[PDB]
Nucleic acid binder design. Structure first.
Ligand SMILES: [Mg+2]
Ligand SMILES: [Mg+2]
Ligand SMILES: [Mg+2]
Ligand SMILES: [Mg+2]
Ligand SMILES: [Mg+2]
Ligand SMILES: [Mg+2]
Ligand SMILES: [Mg+2]
Ligand SMILES: [Mg+2]
Ligand SMILES: [Mg+2]
Ligand SMILES: [Mg+2]
Ligand SMILES: [Mg+2]
Ligand SMILES: [Mg+2]
Ligand SMILES: [Mg+2]
Ligand SMILES: [Mg+2]
Ligand SMILES: [Mg+2]
Ligand SMILES: [Mg+2]
Ligand SMILES: [Mg+2]
Ligand SMILES: [Mg+2]
Ligand SMILES: [Mg+2]
Ligand SMILES: [Mg+2]
Ligand SMILES: [Mg+2]
Ligand SMILES: [Mg+2]
Ligand SMILES: [Mg+2]
Ligand SMILES: [Mg+2]
Ligand SMILES: [Mg+2]
Ligand SMILES: [Mg+2]
Ligand SMILES: [Mg+2]
Ligand SMILES: [N+]
Ligand SMILES: [N+]
Length: 387
RNA sequence: GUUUGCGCGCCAUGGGCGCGCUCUAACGGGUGUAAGUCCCGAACAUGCCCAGGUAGUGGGAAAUGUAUAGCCGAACAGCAAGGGUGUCUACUGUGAGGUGGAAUCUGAAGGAAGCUGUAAGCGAAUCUCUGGUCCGACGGACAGAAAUCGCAUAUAAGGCUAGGCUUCGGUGAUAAGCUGGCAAAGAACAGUGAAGUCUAAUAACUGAAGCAGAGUAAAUGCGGCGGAUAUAUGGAGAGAAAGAGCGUGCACCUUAAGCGUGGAGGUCUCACAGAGGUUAGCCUAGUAACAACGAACUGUGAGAAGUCAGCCGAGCCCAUAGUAGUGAAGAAGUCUCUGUAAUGGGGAUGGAGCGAAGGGGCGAACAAUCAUAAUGUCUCGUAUUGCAGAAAUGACAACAUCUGCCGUAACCAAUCGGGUAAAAGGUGGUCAAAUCAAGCGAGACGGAAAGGAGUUGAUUGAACCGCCGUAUACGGAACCGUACGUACGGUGGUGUGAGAGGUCGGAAUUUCUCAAUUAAGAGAAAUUCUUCCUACUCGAU
DNA sequence: GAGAGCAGGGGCTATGAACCTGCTCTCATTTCTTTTG
């Protein structure tokens, strides 16, 4: 019956729509995602019969569009009921779940008083699992042998099937967390487990590693998995800290995520980048919206204002280098309100770009108000608006 | 399409090789056959230091100037022949046009071999040693090339900017260079500063190594080797060594804005004829040119402005033109020494030739594209086999798993000693399974289906970035530039900007027609995209 | 304006780094050219 639910016209159309919304690469067949509608209209009976009589290929990284499409169909039918059996503190590749929820729940549990963190990471996941125990776990849940044959055929050969099957594999780890009596959140093969004591956390860590290497079959990494205080814990891009009052543990953008944002911002504000500065401002704005929307549940106000000053400095260097020329620099400085003596003095200091864009007449002519009216969004103001 | 940028000729105020005349170290001495060379003797004025941040006097150590004949002339100021304008005014031509004034810009990095006065800088054979800088292409530094070696270099080597931490801590002056947060180069100013050399005197009153970070790039950095170095490159030691100015000779050699002179091809104007249109009369264009409207085209003569930008282009065609110009002070040809990566340079004969300019066509060659008997396998059996689950009975008291401590200072955060599967404990018993057995696979082992392991031609190469060698000139030695400076030779790299006009060609959309007044079928008017052309207007070099 | 420091808090991973407040403090520039992306 579950292959009849896979091979039902609504599900096939939704898998097609999700594939053409993804707009992924073609694969080994080379077929376009725009070609998928024609090939469905000309092989609907062929695809459905080749799947129902178990003769289908899983042709083998990017999957082929027909392979990714059938993977989508099985994933849309198997993300429910598996989602019904899942735990509450699992947040990765699930509907209505994200990293923000994980950080909120981790903060609430640490604020209960579970200071010591057990970091457990699963290493090289779909390589490490054997297919038979995974697929008899799926068989414990799914009773239709056609689904078992097609899913195993996809495993012996990313797309939405793979994180679902991974979350099925790690739901046993979550189940034994609930059985053991432990507080945790898990996104997707990265889980932090929160207990109260160092002896407790070491014992929990070794018991978990023994469980995963024995019962689950996966092998955990000795390098990435560790025990740590929340000051030393990163999780889904978030660092952590303790507020000086004891009321809250509070989320912090980790230094790696801050460095990622700074790298993308320094790319988007290159001086020699030949696009117009309105385009750089627009791309910078979109990057700022994405990063602030990810980290608005963290505490980064000093970081936001320092990054604002950095962005404005780099944009002033961009504008000054686009003027390029001492008469052009003097003309625009006089236009923006600098007197001609200071404007000529600064404009014939056009080389030393960083120095003159740091201070003085360039800071007055290219002001924060004028950059705001130019189109630049402050990190601080958008951050205060978001939370 | 970047003031100018073409051919040919002339001319040094440019450079060589000679001849002369004069001058050469503040002012004097010496030393000496011989002094511009080597040595010796003052003052004044700055630089620096006697400091506490200054002045003002007293003092003093190195350094510089007055103060070598002389050179040069700022990114210094002024003058300035000329050039441009779609600005304005006059005159003259029938017109294309021309000439003269004002106004404004310009007078440039390549010949008025522009002119005048500076600031600053420089300023003497040769040898030896040494510092710094530059070069050994281009190319993120491969490939290709005639074109250094090794290493490293974009989740950014490296340099630089502002702080922090840990250790330490007084001689200074000359002085090329280095750096000032980076595309590259210069000039300016500031801070430093290599190599050595020189000094380490006097007296007072009134900053270094490192260390991790942060920020900042149109990318080269370090070391070796070889070479260059008159911005008269910083110095040290030798050196009785040359340097400068003026004049004058050489069938001396060269030069893009100087002087003279040529401008085809296209474009435009006028006058005659023919061809036309319209009312013997008048016109022949315009829309940038092609195209299309239009009667507006064709000859002949007379004139006017005017050329002159490498990118695949040897060579041939048109016309100035076999003309200007060069050639007998000796051409072409031939022979012979040779050089480069390539372009060349001598000689000896020979006796006359050689031979331009702008713009269009055609085009060899080159580059890019375009065309011309197993395994395995489908379906059978054979023995197995991977991973679920349930359970007749045995073996035993240990197996997991979750909660973080002990004492002491009269009172604990290894705050004080010890430990971290440390106390005290909870929680669930722990496996071994005879038997039975799911679904999906995996290999074997055989038996039959099948199945098999260049030529030639066409299109395109629109434009652009350069680098390198020689010659020849400049800004500003080098480096960067002057259209890749230009000319001639070599080499890589990028790829077809916008508007407007045409093609209104090909394909799509709206509406008609055919099909049958049926189609996501075909044709047509319009529209859009698109192939292609046009410096016509910009933009880029 | 961009960039620093200080304190100035408290609690815990306690003689450190986290954050969010302030003060409080500096740095002010070649009055010139040239050439390609
Ligand atoms: Mg004398
Ligand atoms: Mg005497
Ligand atoms: Mg000149
Ligand atoms: Mg000149
Ligand atoms: Mg003078
Ligand atoms: Mg002088
Ligand atoms: Mg000198
Ligand atoms: Mg070179
Ligand atoms: Mg290079
Ligand atoms: Mg760096
Ligand atoms: Mg000197
Ligand atoms: Mg530079
Ligand atoms: Mg200089
Ligand atoms: Mg030499
Ligand atoms: Mg000197
Ligand atoms: Mg010339
Ligand atoms: Mg004429
Ligand atoms: Mg001309
Ligand atoms: Mg030409
Ligand atoms: Mg061309
Ligand atoms: Mg060509
Ligand atoms: Mg021309
Ligand atoms: Mg062709
Ligand atoms: Mg010079
Ligand atoms: Mg040079
Ligand atoms: Mg050059
Ligand atoms: Mg140039
Ligand atoms: N020109
Ligand atoms: N060029």
């Amino acid at each position: 019956n579950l292959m009849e639910q896979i091979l039902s016209s609504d599900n096939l159309n939704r898998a097609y729509l999700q594939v053409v919304r993804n707009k992924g690469a073609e694969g080994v067949d080379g077929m376009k995602y725009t070609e998928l509608k024609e090939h469905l209209a000309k092989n609907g009976e062929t695809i459905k019969g080749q799947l129902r009589t178990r003769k289908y290929k899983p042709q083998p990284g990017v999957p082929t569009v027909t392979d990714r499409f059938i993977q989508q169909a099985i994933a849309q039918v198997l993300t429910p009921i598996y989602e019904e059996q899942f735990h509450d503190h699992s947040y990765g590749f699930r509907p209505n779940r994200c990293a923000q929820q994980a950080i909120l729940t981790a903060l609430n549990i640490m604020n209960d008083g579970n200071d010591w963190i057990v970091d457990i990471d699963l290493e090289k996941f779909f390589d490490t699992v054997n297919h038979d125990k995974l697929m008899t776990l799926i068989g414990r849940t799914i009773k239709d042998g056609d689904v078992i044959s097609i899913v195993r055929k996809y495993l012996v050969s990313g797309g939405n099937l793979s994180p679902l099957l991974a979350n099925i594999m790690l739901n046993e780890l979550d189940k034994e967390m609930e059985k053991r009596g432990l507080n945790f959140v898990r996104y997707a093969d990265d889980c932090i487990i929160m207990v109260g004591s160092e002896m407790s956390a070491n014992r929990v860590m070794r018991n978990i590693s023994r469980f995963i290497e024995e019962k689950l079959g996966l092998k955990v990494n000795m390098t990435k998995s560790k025990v740590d205080r929340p000051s030393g814990l990163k999780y889904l891009g978030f660092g952590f800290y303790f507020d000086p009052r004891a009321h809250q543990f509070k989320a912090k953008p980790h230094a790696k995520s801050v460095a990622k944002f700074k790298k993308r911002m320094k790319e988007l504000t290159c001086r020699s980048w030949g696009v117009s500065n309105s385009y750089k401002v627009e791309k910078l704005n979109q990057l700022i919206r994405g990063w602030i929307n990810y980290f608005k549940i963290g505490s980064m106000k000093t970081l936001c204002k320092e990054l604002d000053s950095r962005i404005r400095y780099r944009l002033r260097m961009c504008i000054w280098k686009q003027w390029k020329t001492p008469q052009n620099q003097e003309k625009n400085l006089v236009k923006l309100g600098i007197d001609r003596n200071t404007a000529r003095r600064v404009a014939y200091t056009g080389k030393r770009i960083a120095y003159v864009c740091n201070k003085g007449a360039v800071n007055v002519a290219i002001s924060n108000k004028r950059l705001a009216s130019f189109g630049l969004i402050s990190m601080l103001d958008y951050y205060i608006e978001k939370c």
